[PDB]
Amino acid sequence: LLLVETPIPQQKHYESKPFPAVISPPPALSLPLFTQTIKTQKHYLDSLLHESGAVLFRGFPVNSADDFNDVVEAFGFDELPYVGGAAPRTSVVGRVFTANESPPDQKIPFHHEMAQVREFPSKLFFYCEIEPKCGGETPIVLSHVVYERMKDKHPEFVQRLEEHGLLYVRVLGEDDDPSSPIGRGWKSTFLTHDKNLAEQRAVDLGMKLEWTEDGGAKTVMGPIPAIKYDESRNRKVWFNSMVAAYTGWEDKRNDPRKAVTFGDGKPLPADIVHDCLRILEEECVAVPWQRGDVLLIDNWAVLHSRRPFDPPRRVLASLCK
Amino acid sequence: AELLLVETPIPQQKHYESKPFPAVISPPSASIPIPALSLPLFTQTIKTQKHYLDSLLHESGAVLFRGFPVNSADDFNDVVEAFGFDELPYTSVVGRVFTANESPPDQKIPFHHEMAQVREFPSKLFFYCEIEPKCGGETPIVLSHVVYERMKDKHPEFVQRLEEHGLLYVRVLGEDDDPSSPIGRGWKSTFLTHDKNLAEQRAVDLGMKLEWTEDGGAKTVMGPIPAIKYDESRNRKVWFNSMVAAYTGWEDKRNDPRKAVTFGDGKPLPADIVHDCLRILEEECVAVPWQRGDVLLIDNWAVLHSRRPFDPPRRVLASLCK
Ligand SMILES: [Fe+3]
Ligand SMILES: [Fe+3]
Questions:
Q1: Domain around B194
Q2: CA B289, CA B296: separation in Å to the nearest integer?
Q3: Is B176 in a helix, a strand, or coil?
Q4: List of chain A residues whose C-beta atoms are within 8 Å of the C-beta of residue B193
Q5: Which residues neighbour ligand 1 (ion) by CB within 5 Å?
Q6: Do B93 and A179 touch (CB under 8 A)?
Q7: Neighbour-count burial for B197-212, b at 16+ CB within 10 Å, e otherwise
Q8: What are A's interface residues with B at a Cβ cutoff of 8 A?
Q9: A171 bridge partner residues
Q10: CATH code assigned at B165
Q11: Chain B residue with minimal CA distance to A188?
């Protein structure tokens, strides 16, 4: 067959590079012909991903979870083994999983997948098996651009983060609440029912777990950096969950404003965090999904969100080491 | 090119009234001509042998298909799509195929009838082994009408009080969801709502009284409902309920199984008799070891199923019929 770099409305451009790059089709199209071209075009697709940081594959016959898994499987990358510290995921087939994100009428803030985890995914794929009835887009934005704008806007603020970093406080109940923006419990996060076994995996994950009265838990993480360095492209990125925590970690157990602070305890300037929230919006590209689309996101360069939505909707994913 | 569906015997099968349980079909050894067993030939033979497969499934309660090119979830969906049963109106792997949210391997799943307390339960069910368990993992099955007949013969009075009073099912669920619980789902993720009024309205649509505990939780009561139904296709009574199941497997921090199921009038069931029912179920069951490629078809009106503990890997898919 073949692969074709195609233009779309939403995409943006940076130094003559489309974001995201879009690949579409030009023996009639088949699912085994596609996975076959994926292997045949490995170099081309590694570079395109390197140049753009994400590529949406639209038009190909990926019509099921198993189908998406063949495409994920065809890509070669090794799966990232789960260790705990993320919403309750449900295995579907092979390297592909699902997870009932926060309530459908909410906004999922921008973040890097498992950003506060030691072994975070280098890459990830998103796949739509069920088109959203309304809304429910997976807006994406280039982390390095957000860095070039933050350093430009608030140069002193970045400097404090580069020296002080951030601290995160995330109170977790014993069970999971499907109502909160971040409703995972401690037994679910750490895949443990026992406390010792838990507080142990807690230290291994680099967290300060301290059991709460009502069987809950209050974890503390950091100081940790906010500006990491993607070596493959020699550039720093906004690899932190500042906006996610400050505006998103909001429920009966956590205060948004207290969710995250400077690495040395000093509170963050509200007008600065929300200014960052505004930078993410402006630079983000939210391509409306379609049944069959496959988006390849490099986790070193991209943060992902989720617009609110009205069901039905089914987006599947795959995490790479 | 044609294919022979050959009835075959296996060590684990039983026989009642001369009929095998479960009936087992496989493709012959030396056929004339010799067919190149394929998945597309199998599904065509299933469509062509509809009547024969209706009689076998009709008289045996379940039919295990052994020795067929069912090599992936895609192949399994093609089989289910050849039998012609309507799909049960609504995770999803492909088409009508899906993975069943289960408990840890070391645990044993109690015997039951699929969706036994849901107005529109599956009439028929399919199980498929894509990956045979390293150890155990079998999907034991048992004939519901046999359990009924033996219980009535051993405990006539108790059976008489079962049909007359029925059963009461109690569940004390939290607001949130405990991951480590066989019945961990709380009222939120149960009735898809945060609002207490709507939630209780929905539980009521499901024929159930919903109580609001002061601890932010909820207590639900179902019944009285029969513990014994009548298979019309086979003109016989079936032990269609979840008594033994709930009495032994409905436990966690908020729930005690001993009081999870009682007589429809609130009177507790005799522990000795429930365990005695557990005994009959275990004796009459058939636990055929799973071989990759197998697809088991169960008539949900005549058969209760459960699971054995196992050591992974193990992968089984399923499909439900209206
Ligand atoms: Fe995410
Ligand atoms: Fe079951």
A1: 1-322
A2: 12
A3: coil
A4: none
A5: A 113
A6: no
A7: eebbebbeeeebebee
A8: 64-67, 88, 90-93, 98, 129, 173-179, 183, 185, 187-188, 193
A9: A218
A10: 3.60.130.10
A11: B179
Q: A98 to chain B: which residues are within 8 Å by CB?
A: 91
Size of the A and B interface in Cβ pairs below 8 Å: 60
How was this structure obtained?
A: X-ray
Q: Give Cα separations from A212 to A186, A209, A265, B217, B244 (angstroms).
A: 11, 9, 21, 20, 37
Phi, psi of B109 (to 5 degrees): -90, 130
Mark the binding-site residues of A for Fe cation, compressed into ranges. 111, 113, 304
What does this entry list as its resolution, in Å? 2.4
Q: What are the C-alpha distances in Å from B180 to residues A86, A178, A188, A293, B92?
A: 16, 16, 8, 35, 23
Number of structural domains (chain A) is: 1
How many CB atoms are located within 10 Å of the residue A321 CB? 12
Q: Residue B66 in contact with residue B8, Cβ under 8 Å?
A: yes
Find chain A residues with C-beta within 8 A of B93's C-beta: 64-66, 92-93
Looking at chain A, list the stretches that DSSP marks H as alpha helix, in order from N- to C-terminal side: 31-40, 42-52, 65-74, 143-153, 155-164, 186-189, 195-204, 242-243, 256-259, 270-283
Q: Mind giving me the DSSP string for B197-229?
A: HHHHHHHHHTS-EEE--TTS-EEEEEEEE-S-E
Residue B305 in marked binding region: yes
Enumerate residues 6+ apart whose C-beta is below 8 A from B18. none
User: B257 and B249 in contact (C-beta within 8 Å)?
Assistant: yes
How close, in Å, is residue A277 to chain B by CA atoms?
Answer: 29
